Amino acid sequence: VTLTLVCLAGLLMLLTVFGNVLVIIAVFTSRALKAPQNLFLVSLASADILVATLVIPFSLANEVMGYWYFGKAWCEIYLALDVLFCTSSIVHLCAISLDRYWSITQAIEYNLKRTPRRIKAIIITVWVISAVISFPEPRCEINDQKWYVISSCIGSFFAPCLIMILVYVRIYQIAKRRTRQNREKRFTFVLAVVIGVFVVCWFPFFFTYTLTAVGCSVPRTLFKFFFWFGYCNSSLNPVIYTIFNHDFRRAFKKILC
Amino acid sequence: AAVERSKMIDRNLREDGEKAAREVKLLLLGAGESGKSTIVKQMTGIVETHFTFKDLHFKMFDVGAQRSERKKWIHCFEGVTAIIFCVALSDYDLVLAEDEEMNRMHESMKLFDSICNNKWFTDTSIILFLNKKDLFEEKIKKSPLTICYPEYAGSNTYEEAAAYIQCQFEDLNKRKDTKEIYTHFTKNVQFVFDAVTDVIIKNNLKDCGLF
Amino acid sequence: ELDQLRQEAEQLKNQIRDARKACADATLSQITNNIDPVGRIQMRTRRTLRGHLAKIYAMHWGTDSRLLVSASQDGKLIIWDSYTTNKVHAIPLRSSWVMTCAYAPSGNYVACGGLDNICSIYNLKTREGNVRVSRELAGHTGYLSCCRFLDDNQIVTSSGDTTCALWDIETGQQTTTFTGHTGDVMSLSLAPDTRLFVSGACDASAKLWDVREGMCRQTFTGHESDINAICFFPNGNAFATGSDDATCRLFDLRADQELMTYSHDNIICGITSVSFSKSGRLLLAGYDDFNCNVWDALKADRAGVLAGHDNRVSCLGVTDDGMAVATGSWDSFLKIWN
Amino acid sequence: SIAQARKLVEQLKMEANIDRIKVSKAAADLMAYCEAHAKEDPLLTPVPASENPFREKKFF
Ligand SMILES: Cc1cccc([C@H](C)c2c[nH]cn2)c1C
């Protein structure tokens, strides 16, 4: 099944780019969405666009044709250019967590210093951390060295998932001391997806990735399927972080409809 | 030339807007004998009172000097982080100066009802203040509160009357699901700090839809 | 007895009402019935003067037809340049509650006003640096809802104190006071010769105030609610009132009656500004439905719509040249619908 | 109350006896003026770009 899978990947790419472009446009062309926090949304949407254009077209081929990559010198720079265009996302989900934690736990103190002078620095810090974690017949198997998979796995998806899971179990606590108006299902559900999605899509991959370090019998086909959830998560991301907010929804209604 | 001048003008305007956005604004309202001046002291046209508590920045606009129709200029106050309101508990024993047999507190409720159930302040929360508590606590010892409500049961009492009045005041915000109404019986600025911290946190906790 | 005054006043009002009828021959819509329609009118925002950080509450085109003022709740009174969009000036006010503006006819002074009940006047050409508050006229008992220069000295303001007042910017003393108007005074407009001006109260009425002798001359009624705007036919013999009744009306100074009523079923919101084309045949009415409807002042048949604003239109002004329409809405952008 | 009512009555009597003109003459003097300034209105009759300083013309 080649044409069907290629078409499915094409649907993936189209949806990803469409949603991220919509979010990027709605963030700018709207008076209401003028808060500084939206710089993170714009940067994350840009990362989703990049990983949806410069990455998927090649890594779908490498699995479809089932043979030598198209090229031998453009790999050493995309093999680490798809592994840094995801870590950018996985760490922008650990930055939109610290932001949306400090804007609740310490409101008055953080509502000052909540200006672009620091948001830009944070975004540059994320985009340099990603790069630091990216650089460490024949097929281009992702570099699996006994000392590089461990560090990449525990620096790219075990800090950003131990810092957005110890930062969304508080916003659950705070959202219990600050509602007192029978909104139990509101702050209890929407806080379950933003992590429910982030860990159902990704973790099934990283678990096997670093589990190979002990040579466990991970099936090859199932692993090469787990490999492909990262991009679908890069697709699902813009809607998760934008639907619920009222201003984003109004901008979506005004632009799309 | 003109391009550079206008660029510098834009830069200054952006800087001033950024510095101003870090302010909290409080429209202060009350009836004639409400006692808002007492609140201002403790804590023509618009009078702006700028203060700072625990390293914050409040502006409070007193507009009671404006003797004209209220629906024609209230538009300007759509965007205040809260609306402080002041009522006079010793005002249930005063009839309107011009009108006859118009209990001053009834007029105060009418004003507050107009403020709350209004199309502009549909989310802007109110912070209610019930001034002159002690004077009322002494006044009620001879004049039953039933004079000002022919639907009252429970003989004169301060632990009950001041809760019944608060009930009648909180029974007027038909937007029960949108705006909160805090209440304190005039550390008052400490209460305003603790009640605008809640507004700021509950407006941050709604930009992401959690609330 | 006072009842004598009441009864005779009632009979006097009835006499006026039944004597106006005698001056009726046929409705304006009958006489102009064979007039040539105007068709459709399209207007596209040539510029979009940007920079305000809050609502926009007024404006005034300069006599040059190039510069234009604009006031916002951001606390700054800006003076733009329509052609290039460069902000020529940006005055930092003292109180950020503004409800008016008035660019001088000679362009050397500007004014302001608002809830502070004070009409401040600013001199643009300091001769040594930036601007400075030239004067501050105080003496009104209510917010200042409109104000226009008679010349570079006299300024006639109107407030919610149920009065108007002609000032003297040289000495800051009310030269005259126009009292006799029941409700507020939501807006006014001078005449071509600056010897008469109509004031529109929130009492559902208008009054043709004189200036020389400080006394009304005529009173027009027929509106069913407040009157948020008013303007003159460019020849100073008719004025169009825009109410919160959602209907504009065209009143005649000479005949002292009502001529046309511009209303439609599809509109239920209230007007907030009106203006005429230089030919006086386009009653541009800036509604509160996010729109700014063009009309046809002689047949009432709407002939366009300037719908481009994300928030209600609060300012609407046609230059003296006649070839532009600057509209300002609560979303902080000024549009120029050439 | 009395004096204010008397002043109102005086104003009303002064404004009642003012003279007027039939609606026909006012209608004629309205439409005649509206016609008189046809070519001088750049909105009623849209003007070409040669007279559109906003679109393309002398702006210096
Ligand atoms: C360690 C690491 C970090 C980020 C991305 C990846 C790769 C490219 C992947 C697989 N599926 C989605 N992304 C890795 C291996």
Residue numbers in the entry:
A (entry chain R): 47 to 182, 200 to 242, 380 to 457
B (entry chain A): 11 to 53, 182 to 324, 330 to 354
C (entry chain B): 3 to 340
D (entry chain G): 8 to 67
Please quote the authors directly.
In the sympathetic nervous system, endogenous epinephrine and norepinephrine regulate various physiological functions by activating adrenergic receptors (ARs). α2-ARs are Gi-coupled GPCRs that can inhibit adenylyl cyclase and decrease intracellular cAMP levels. To investigate the mechanism underlying the molecular recognition of epinephrine by an α-AR, we solved the structures of human α2A-AR bound to epinephrine (an endogenous agonist) or dexmedetomidine (a synthetic agonist) and in complex with its cognate signaling Gi heterotrimer (Gαi(G203A)Gβ1Gγ2).
Overall, the structures of the α2A-AR–Gi complex are similar in the presence of epinephrine and dexmedetomidine, with a root-mean-square deviation (RMSD) of 1.1 Å over 865 Cα atoms. Interactions between dexmedetomidine and residues F4277.38 and Y4317.42 in α2A-AR were similar in the GaMD simulations and in our cryo-EM structure. In contrast, dexmedetomidine formed only three hydrogen bonds with the α2A-AR residues Y4317.42, C1323.36, and F4277.38.
